[PDB]
Design an enzyme around this catalytic site. Structure first.
Site, PDB file in Angstrom:
ATOM      1  N   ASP A  73       0.825  -1.203   0.000  1.00  0.00           N
ATOM      2  CA  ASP A  73       0.000   0.000   0.000  1.00  0.00           C
ATOM      3  C   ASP A  73       0.861   1.256   0.000  1.00  0.00           C
ATOM      4  O   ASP A  73       1.348   1.676   1.043  1.00  0.00           O
ATOM      5  CB  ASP A  73      -0.894  -0.037   1.245  1.00  0.00           C
ATOM      6  CG  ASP A  73      -1.806   1.161   1.353  1.00  0.00           C
ATOM      7  OD1 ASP A  73      -1.931   1.895   0.360  1.00  0.00           O
ATOM      8  OD2 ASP A  73      -2.431   1.328   2.440  1.00  0.00           O
TER       9      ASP A  73
ATOM     10  N   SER B  81      -0.861  15.540 -12.056  1.00  0.00           N
ATOM     11  CA  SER B  81      -1.115  15.183 -13.436  1.00  0.00           C
ATOM     12  C   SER B  81      -1.372  16.447 -14.257  1.00  0.00           C
ATOM     13  O   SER B  81      -1.915  17.426 -13.759  1.00  0.00           O
ATOM     14  CB  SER B  81      -2.309  14.224 -13.507  1.00  0.00           C
ATOM     15  OG  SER B  81      -2.723  13.981 -14.845  1.00  0.00           O
TER      16      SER B  81
END
Length: 330
Positions: A35, A199
């Site tokens: 994770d 992004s």
């Protein structure tokens, strides 16, 4: 040194991925959920409340000659999905794919929430976010990666998750045969303890690319892709009959649909998520309403590039002095 381990979807939907991890001496192999959005290595154990164990493999520290109780240490964690667990702490030898860390903090669960109990395939978590998020008290502990870093050939790990197939976690090297083209690297903020990046935009299907900054985290421990409501609405508007269902808890779509791809930007590069990666199947057995793999982050407080996004790429988690993230097509 290096390590390399195969990671395997837990079910036919890729709800999560499990990776075998050797703990203790002799080795006790547990299948952990790696994770990159948390920083605790915790396991089902011989100390876990018996009624809260349902099929998981447990770590038994009393059977490990290298286990030592970390005196006075406790841990307690709550995840973004409302699940939680807590317990005490041992140090022990932990190996992943041939890479060994001695003295790793292994957080033994005394209690786990029902969501964990119900998932027989996940024996615990191995956190790969920054150690500043580790919950051990009163002395915070380091992640497996943080402990291994100085010994690694290069201070990196890579995630290569498969779509409905196994994939690979590598530590200490970049497998140049595992991706196509080049890896595009992008800046990381560690201020919140995550692999947080921005992004450069998105496209839906064969549509034009929208240049827009989307801050979010690269999180292998989250199944879906969570993005701003504007972006998510633009995606689902291209699927006839798709709608946000408050009762189901997100966007659903007719199972008869063909889903468009979704592209996200990494600098000037582009990662294309095929439409099929966005299908999470019937909302309940036999239903013709299917659950979407792109959902709104509104009210999470952060955008999450979870497995839906990451499995479309070869992802480099670069833990150099100034960390960065790399993405390649594959």
């Amino acid at each position: 040194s290096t390590g390399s381990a195969t990671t395997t979807p837990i079910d036919s939907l890729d709800d999560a991925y499990i990776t075998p991890v050797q703990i203790g001496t002799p080795a006790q192999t547990l299948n952990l959920d790696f994770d990159t959005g948390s920083s605790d290595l915790w396991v089902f154990s011989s100390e876990t409340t018996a009624s809260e164990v349902d099929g998981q493999t447990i770590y038994t520290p009393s059977k490990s000659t290298t286990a030592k109780l970390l005196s006075g240490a406790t841990w307690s964690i709550s995840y973004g999905d409302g699940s939680s667990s807590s317990g005490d702490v041992y140090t022990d030898t932990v190996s992943v794919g041939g890479l060994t860390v001695t003295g790793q903090a292994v957080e033994s669960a005394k209690k786990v929430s029902s969501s964990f109990t119900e998932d027989s395939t996940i024996d615990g978590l191995l956190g790969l976010a920054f150690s500043t998020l580790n919950t051990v008290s009163p002395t915070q502990q380091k992640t497996f990666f943080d402990n291994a870093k100085a010994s690694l050939d290069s201070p990196v790990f890579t995630a290569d998750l498969g779509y409905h197939a196994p994939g690979t976690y590598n530590f200490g090297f970049i497998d140049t045969t595992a991706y196509t083209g080049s890896i595009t690297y992008t800046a990381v903020s560690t201020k919140q303890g995550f692999w947080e990046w921005t992004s450069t935009g998105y496209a839906v299907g064969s549509g034009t690319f929208k240049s827009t900054s989307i801050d979010g985290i690269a999180d292998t421990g989250t199944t879906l892709l969570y993005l701003p409501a504007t972006v998510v609405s633009a995606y689902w508007a291209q699927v006839s009959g798709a709608k946000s269902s408050s009762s189901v808890g997100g966007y659903v779509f007719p199972c008869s649909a063909t889903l468009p791809s979704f592209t996200f930007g990494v600098g000037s590069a582009r990662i294309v998520i095929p439409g099929d990666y966005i299908d999470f199947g019937p909302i309940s057995t036999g239903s013709s309403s299917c659950f979407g793999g792109i959902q709104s982050s509104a009210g999470i407080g952060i955008n999450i590039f979870g497995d839906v996004a990451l499995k479309a790429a070869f992802v480099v988690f670069n833990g150099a002095t100034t960390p960065t993230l790399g993405f390649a097509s594959k």
